[PDB]
Structure formats: C-alpha cells, structure tokens
Paper text:
Ryanodine receptors (RyR) are >2-MDa membrane proteins that allow for the release of Ca2+ from the ER and SR, thus mediating a range of Ca2+-dependent processes. Each forms homotetrameric assemblies of ~5000 residue long subunits. Mutations in RyR1, the skeletal muscle isoform, can cause malignant hyperthermia (MH), central core disease (CCD), and other myopathies. Here, a collection of cryoEM structures provides insights into the molecular consequences of MHrelated RyR mutation R615C, and how apoCaM opens RyR1.
Author numbering: 1 to 56, 61 to 127, 139 to 148
The structure:
Amino acid sequence: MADQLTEEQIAEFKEAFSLFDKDGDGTITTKELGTVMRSLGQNPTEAELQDMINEVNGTIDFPEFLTMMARKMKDTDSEEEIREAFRVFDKDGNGYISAAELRHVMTNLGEKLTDEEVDEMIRYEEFVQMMTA
C-alpha cells in the first residue's frame, strides 16, 4: 500500500535513508534502524523499534523500510487528511452549519449513490467516522 504515500514524502525519506547509510547496501542491524528513526526527527519508543525489527537478521532492505514507513505515515496521513477534509466542505457552511446543508452536498454529489441510501445512513465528521468503521 504505497499509493497513500506522497511523491515529496517518499523523496524526502529516500534522501534521509541515503544520507544515513554508509558505504554499501542499506541492510544494517536494527540498531542502525533505530538510530535512523531517531535522526529522522520522529520519537519512536522501544516498542516501535521492536515492531520495526520484527517487520524486517539485521537486514534493513529498502522494501521493508518502505513498508514500515508506509504503515506509519499512512496512519499519520489518514489522520491529517481527515483533519484537513473536515473543513473541505466550505461551500456548505462555515463549520457543520446544518445537517440538511451537508446532506444536500453529500447526496447531490460525491459518487454514484442512491438517494434513499444517504438518508437512511444519516439516521459531518460523525458520518465519515461511521463510514470508515
């Protein structure tokens, strides 16, 4: 699931990975992975380091690094995108002004959807959270 990743994000993370590593391949012991995470600016605890080691004997391959960063940055980007898109519907109102106002935008647009299904699901962010669950 590398599609949730941004081109600039993957470029920056590859740049950091290339700067951290020494001569040779990127496969070094898990202590190197922990130190790279510390240098990247993140605050990974011992449990996060253990999970990253288990995901990847002391070989940090670019695919495994990309996968662990994919899951982490994907959770982070999902949270950030939810927070940003909470204010995406600026035309409906200032903030969650009316249930009918949001329902009109959600039913007149969004996807090929059934008119009665939107009303049934109604009975802003709460609807998105319910749909995600």
